[PDB]
């Protein structure tokens, strides 16, 4: 009833630097307590480079919600958001 | 020489760049003052690309006059502030990169590219596609505490 | 002498009138418009130079383009009272003339000041509205100056779309007073909305609203 | 000294003071810049 159709989107189909801090952060929270990895891992233990990793290769499965100021919001998957 | 449909495309260039005159001179800058503060370095973009493709050694460029005007035109409407299809977010969406596009169209003429820049199509092409993508990221990301 | 400069600050208030009848939507002559002050001074100013604040009452009919751009946009007339101190019976004539041949709204302007007694009798037009002006205010038309951009008032429908698009309720949008000299020379309403176009020097052009109180 | 120690103290106040009169104003998804009421202060931030 709020939703906004994937076609009718109008924001910025990029990742802001917020959205990204975000992603990253809770990323290597979930790697933190042991969620499953979906990149292969080399030999890096941090969880943030961990999160990095996935991110560049738009391996993150999360969706952003972008709330309109009236109350709508539109749904961005992480890997339709271009990263610089 | 002779060509009249080239001619007629360079006429509506020139009325362009006369209307942006008149209105940068008469309502915006009364006073005059031609430096201001823009996003986008276009001087830094040119002479990169001039480093990268060697645009020295003063060799005949090999663009058209159709191509230069409608890349440059498609670029101008290119820069996207606000997106959607409604009349008064286009309406802004103009009003908004005015004076960007005002910038764009006296830099990237075509004498001064032909002329004195002398791009070739690669560099020309790169040069758009830059000042695409640095436009893009100079915006203000969404959920600033301004 | 004095009285050329009276004369002369009457014609520019008159002129001043005009220009916000004709930025109304109004439809006035370019003759009309184009009063010299010689021509002014022929018509009004009598042998001895008085003036007469009743030949400058006028009727004036919306243009078809603004008629249909604004459908609430009736007759206007305009009247000057002769008398320096406004007597009552002059809006009073004012209020049964409107009532009698039927005016949309009606502008009434005074040279010193008007009583409370008048004040508030001239709300009980109703549905006619009427709205008054000082004389002395209407020497120098405001919207001519540098440091004041255009406004325009915005139809029922472009205010409905410009909600629509900004997701908006009525009491979101920046406010102007009703009693802003810009609102009075529109005569606003309450509600309605006013577009505003600015210079800007990071943009170029601008465009605002403001909605009235 | 004196100017410089009074001077200092003034600009802290209206520093102070500023901060808290535009604390709550941000720039949303549509370009708009609201306060926390929802009210809108820019119709662009920057007109840009």
Known sequence: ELAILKEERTTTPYLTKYERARILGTRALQISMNAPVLVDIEGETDPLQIAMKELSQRKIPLVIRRYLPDGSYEDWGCDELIVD | ?146 | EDNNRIISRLWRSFRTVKEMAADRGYFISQEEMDQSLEEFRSKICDSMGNPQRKLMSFLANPTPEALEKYSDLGTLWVEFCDEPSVGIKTMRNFCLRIQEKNFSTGIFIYQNNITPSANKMIPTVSPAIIETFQESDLVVNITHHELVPKHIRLSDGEKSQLLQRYKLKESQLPRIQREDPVARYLGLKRGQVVKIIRRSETSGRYASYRICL | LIDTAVKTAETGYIQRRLVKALEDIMVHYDGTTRNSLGDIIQFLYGED
């Open chain 2, 1 to 146: 020489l002779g060509d009249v449909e080239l001619q007629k495309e360079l006429n509506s260039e020139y009325e362009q760049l006369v209307s942006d005159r008149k209105f940068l001179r008469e309502i915006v800058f009364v006073n005059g003052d031609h430096n201001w503060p823009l996003p986008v370095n276009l001087r830094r973009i040119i002479q990169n690309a001039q480093q990268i493709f060697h645009l020295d050694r003063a060799k005949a460029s090999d663009l058209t006059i159709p191509e230069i005007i409608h890349g440059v035109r498609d670029l101008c409407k290119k820069l996207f502030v606000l997106r959607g299809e409604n009349e008064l977010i286009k309406e802004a969406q103009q009003n908004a990169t005015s004076l960007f596009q005002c910038l764009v169209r006296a830099r990237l003429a075509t004498r001064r590219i032909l002329e004195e820049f002398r791009l070739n199509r690669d560099a020309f092409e790169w040069v758009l596609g830059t000042i695409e993508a640095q436009f893009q990221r100079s915006l203000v990301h969404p959920g600033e505490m301004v």
